[PDB]
Amino acid sequence: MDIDPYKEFGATVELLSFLPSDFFPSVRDLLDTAAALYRDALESPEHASPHHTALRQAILAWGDLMTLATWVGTNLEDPASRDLVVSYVNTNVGLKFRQLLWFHISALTFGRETVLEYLVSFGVWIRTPPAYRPPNAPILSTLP
Amino acid sequence: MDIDPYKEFGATVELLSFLPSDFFPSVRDLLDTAAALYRDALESPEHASPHHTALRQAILAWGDLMTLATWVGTNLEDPASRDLVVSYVNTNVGLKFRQLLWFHISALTFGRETVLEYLVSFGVWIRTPPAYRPPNAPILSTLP
Amino acid sequence: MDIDPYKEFGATVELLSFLPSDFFPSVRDLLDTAAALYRDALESPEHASPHHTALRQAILAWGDLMTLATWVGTNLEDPASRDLVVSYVNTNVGLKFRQLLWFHISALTFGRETVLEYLVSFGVWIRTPPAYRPPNAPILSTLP
Amino acid sequence: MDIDPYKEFGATVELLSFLPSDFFPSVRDLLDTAAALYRDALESPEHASPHHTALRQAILAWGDLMTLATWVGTNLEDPASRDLVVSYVNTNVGLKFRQLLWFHISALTFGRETVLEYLVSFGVWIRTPPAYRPPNAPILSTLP
Amino acid sequence: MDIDPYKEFGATVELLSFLPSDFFPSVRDLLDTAAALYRDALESPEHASPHHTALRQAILAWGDLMTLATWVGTNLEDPASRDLVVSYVNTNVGLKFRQLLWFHISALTFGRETVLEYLVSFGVWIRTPPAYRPPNAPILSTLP
Amino acid sequence: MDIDPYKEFGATVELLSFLPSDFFPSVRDLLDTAAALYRDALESPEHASPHHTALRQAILAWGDLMTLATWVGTNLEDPASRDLVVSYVNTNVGLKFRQLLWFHISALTFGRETVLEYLVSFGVWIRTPPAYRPPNAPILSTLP
Ligand SMILES: COC(=O)c1c(CN2CCN(C(=O)CCCNC(=O)c3ccc(C(=O)[O-])c(-c4c5ccc(=[N+](C)C)cc-5oc5cc(N(C)C)ccc45)c3)CC2)nc(-c2ccccn2)nc1-c1ccc(F)cc1Cl
Ligand SMILES: COC(=O)c1c(CN2CCN(C(=O)CCCNC(=O)c3ccc(C(=O)[O-])c(-c4c5ccc(=[N+](C)C)cc-5oc5cc(N(C)C)ccc45)c3)CC2)nc(-c2ccccn2)nc1-c1ccc(F)cc1Cl
């Protein structure tokens, strides 16, 4: 009854379990990137590619929790209520789809195959013990 | 980037603003009806429609929000501090994509064309004042 | 100078007066119809039909009457005289204006043929004795 | 909703603002131009061009603003406030309106080509330094 | 690297040194005239001419300098310390490309050929002493 | 009424918002590079490519502020006047188009596509948290 968010794009939630938590950027940094690079294509009413379809949805989803953050910021009285709730959204639910923002943005910019190869390559990096890991962790980059 | 998802689908948020709040079925019925008859290619690796890709991102979001309601209802202290939040999810944020689930499901069984005419042909039914309104709203259905 | 705003379109004020006054939708409830359905076609720099060129003028004409209901609506010294006039805009100009928007916005969605026939149809249905008539009122609809 | 009343006609408010304000003729002095030249073409039940359909609306739009300047023009209790508003019609609506009539009534007599070129021409001629320019101002004319 | 921009355009800075300081129109009129009739492809992603690319870099520079005048006039303390700077911008640095805007705009409507002849045919008009000078400078214009 | 300085070259001011302030070299270092590599082509009166057209303009623009720096350095008396002004030009207005100098120089040397790919690649570098950023930030380099 539960769908894999990435089963349609080749990747999977288990595969994204490689990437540690702190690896992912903040939601602001990702939203600014899409709104900087793709803002002229996201708002365009065309199916340029499935990531746009997913990316338009993921943005509005976080746009919705911002509402619940603001509603809770004012219509609640207890500090442990008004804070621990909003602390939950940024902490856990925010992390719940910084993957989606990080994934689909990185997929559009770099192609799906380059992202999937990136995950496996990053998987090998993290597996190796600290003594032999090359300190420069692998990082995405285009290729002509 | 401030844009509704209903752009490449030929719609708006104003277009689906005519529909009264009691128009849309419950969230449970929509989720069930999704898996009742779309569970075939909905939870598969296949890609088939652009509606499916947008759909899958909606069902995961509600599963996210329900994780929020379960969290707040069990850990936040005061019901006067949390039942506001719990009822807020089921009431307002739920109705956010309480209709989003409705659009894609209705579009899939019927088509982006037939759903739009039902929306166009509904507002004309609802914009009409009560005294001169037919006693039976138009029925969404496929035309052979 | 008796410039009928409908003589170009195979109609006339007498037919639109032939229907009952209260049948017509409200101004606010009707602007969003084109604003939600035709916001892209109207704002386009190339007209698609004379209804576009005509409806594109009615929207601007209503602009100042709201502005005049806003400038005068908030920049007077006597509130005892503000609603004396500001009420007149929604009183006896909208009645001559809500008819105008309804014609074109219905003319676009259903063609000038069906609207002109509907005016004859509905205007009769309200005249026939109630003992002898189909109680299901006649209405436009995109479906046959 | 930024419905330029000129974007359909290869112009825009900035060009018509590019000319000086006082260049435009008066409303009364301009209505008779179409009323004397185009009283037959406008009142015809078949439009001859989109300028007809557009100019046919501006005349009626000015109708109520005179009526509103007549209803309010004579049906108030405070003359101290009558000219406070009635002056505004000829104050800051005609300025946005005398431009509108001038464009179409000139567009019909001389085609949309010559008017759009004249706006560029005259708007420049008033900008060039007086020491270096033909003092004979540029003007439309039916003769070559 | 010490070179004027008027090289690939077939000109110099000496050639445009004949023109008196009062020759060129104001900076406001040039900026308006740029957007009055070139705003079509001036603020677009298109590349069309080599004049447009040089132009766009001029309009941004003046917007830069005006940001300087606004800054100094509001933050620098003494008018005897700042009005020198403010008037210096509008007077001297303004006239630097007060003519630069004039050359490209005049070149676009007319062509690199026709503008040069007007410059060649102007100096002969201005180098001539006053007693034998025709009372009307040559007029820039296109030749069919 | 405002043009994007980079809208014609594919990039945009938002895209260049990735690069932090201190990343950009000084104006002297860039001018020496162009005057070292391109001084034999900039002064050539030919449109070798649009960056030359932009690059000739950007140089003279900074060449103009050097004049205002020198004029202010001598014809002003107050130290907070003569210093804070010139401090403004080097600090803010200098930074305002060290981008243009850095961009167009890097575009000529490395091709437009390589620069645009560089920005996106640098964008991904800066987004990543410090713990996982490869310490060697990405840097331009040719490719046969
Ligand atoms: C996937 O869709 C859904 O699940 C769904 C649907 C749509 N479907 C399909 C339609 N539907 C039906 O129940 C239809 C069966 C009944 N059939 C009929 O009555 C029927 C059957 C045959 C004929 C027929 O051939 O003559 C006619 C018929 C005509 C047919 C053609 C025609 N011409 C143009 C020539 C003229 C006709 O003139 C008529 C005139 C009549 N007079 C005299 C009054 C009477 C009948 C007719 C009607 C409901 C379900 N709607 C809604 C919804 C929501 C809010 C508000 C309203 N609706 N929500 C959902 C949803 C819910 C939960 C969930 F979790 C997920 C979803 Cl998505
Ligand atoms: C885009 O350009 C501009 O905006 C612009 C222009 C140029 N334009 C176009 C020309 N212009 C006019 O006003 C022309 C209309 C008047 N037409 C006429 O007088 C006219 C029209 C028809 C004929 C005609 O067919 O016979 C003739 C004519 C002749 C024609 C052909 C001919 N042969 C070779 C066979 C012999 C002719 O012998 C004559 C002899 C005469 N006698 C007896 C004295 C009298 C007339 C004629 C003249 C001004 C605008 N200049 C200037 C400028 C600046 C500084 C100093 C001077 N000028 N600044 C700008 C600028 C300003 C602000 C801004 F923000 C941006 C810009 Cl860029």
Numbering used by the authors:
A (entry chain A), B (entry chain B), C (entry chain C), D (entry chain C), E (entry chain B), F (entry chain A): 1 to 144
Q: Which sentences did the original study use to describe this structure?
A:
The HBV Cp is a 183-residue, homodimeric protein. Cp assembles into icosahedral 90-dimer T = 3 capsids and 120-dimer T = 4 capsids. Putative Cp allosteric effectors (e.g. heteraryldihydropyrmidines or HAPs) have been discovered that have antiviral effect. These small molecules ostensibly act by inducing an assembly-active state and by stabilizing Cp-Cp interactions by filling a pocket at the interdimer interface between dimers of the quasi-sixfold.
To examine HAP-bound capsids, we reconstructed T = 4 and T = 3 Cp150-HAP-TAMRA capsids to 4.0 Å and 3.7 Å resolution, respectively, from a single dataset. The resolution was sufficient to position and rebuild molecular models of protein and HAP-TAMRA. These structures are, to our knowledge, the first instance of using cryo-EM to visualize a drug bound to a virus capsid and to show that T = 3 capsids bind CpAMs. Besides the difference in diameter and the differing number of component Cp dimers, the local difference in T = 4 and T = 3 architecture is that quasi-sixfold vertices have twofold and threefold symmetry, respectively. A T = 4 quasi-sixfold has two repeats (B, C, D, B’, C’, and D’) subunits and in T = 3 there are three repeats (B, C, B’, C’, B’', and C’'). In T = 4 capsids, quasi-sixfold hexamers have four HAP-TAMRA molecules, while the T = 3 quasi-sixfold hexamers accommodate three HAP-TAMRA molecules. In the T = 3 particles, HAPs are in B pockets capped by C subunits. The pocket of the T = 3 C subunit is occluded by the neighboring B subunit, resembling the interaction of the T = 4 D subunit with its neighboring B subunit. Despite the quaternary differences between T = 3 and T = 4 capsids, the local environment of the HAP-TAMRA in the HAP pocket was remarkably similar. Long range differences in quaternary structure were apparent when overlaying entire hexamers, for example overlaying T = 3 and T = 4 quasi-sixfold hexamers based on one set of AB dimers. The next subunit around the quasi-sixfold, the D subunit (T = 4) or C subunit (T = 3), show pronounced differences while the dimer on the far side of quasi-sixfold is completely misaligned.
